[PDB]
């Protein structure tokens, strides 16, 4: 019932990662909030994309993303105004 | 990824700085400035060796006011911009704000006076590295990536002509 993601913070030149484990039914937006909290970056100016640079639709579960895209993710700075 | 390895190697080859001292700090500031010049000079040497010699920086005597030039190559053409910044008194905890005055009013990714707007990840990154990051890192991790995003856009829109 859980899935694990390897999430790399791309804004840090050491390229550190964390593995976050969440229930499969967790909304993927919560994964983004969890990852942002863990890296101490704002959720609203961060985004998650696949290891290979692909955009992820947030309106799906973690389990959905885990199978469709894969366990390896990047957390990146987002395009945001101000 | 090739991007990852490139960044890691680039930033790894920039000498880290040592002294936690800002302009208020007399002989310790002098030492910090030596470190800054050493780190900048090594970064420029690396840039020259990587065929991307993209900036020069100088300062006043006191090391509190910095000015220089940067270059961006796009579609075989070279674009040159003047840069400047002031060292805040709480440096190196507080990072300077780099300005590109000739671009003031030309992009929304910028505050007043040509001060570039970096992503929100820059400040935490800087803060957790104090005092090992200095002006060479500010260039490599701040201005450089800003140019790589903004300059092609301004060219494509015809806001800058070369």
Author numbering:
A (entry chain B): 2 to 83
B (entry chain A): 0 to 161
Paper text:
In a pathway analogous to ubiquitin and other UBLs, post-translational attachment of UFM1 to the lysine residues of target proteins, UFMylation, is catalysed by an enzymatic cascade of E1 (UBA5), E2 (UFC1) and E3 (UFL1) enzymes. Collectively, we identify a fundamental role for UREL in dissociating 60S subunits from the SEC61 translocon and the basis for UFMylation in regulating protein homeostasis at the ER.
To understand interactions between UFC1 and UFM1 independent of the UREL complex, we determined the crystal structure of the stable isopeptide-linked UFC1–UFM1 mimic. When compared to other E2–UBL structures in closed and open conformations, our structure reveals that UFM1 adopts an intermediate state. Taken together, these data suggest that UFC1 α0 may prevent UFM1 from readily adopting a closed conformation, therefore stabilizing an intermediate state. We therefore postulate that α0 would need to be remodelled during E3-mediated activation of UFC1.
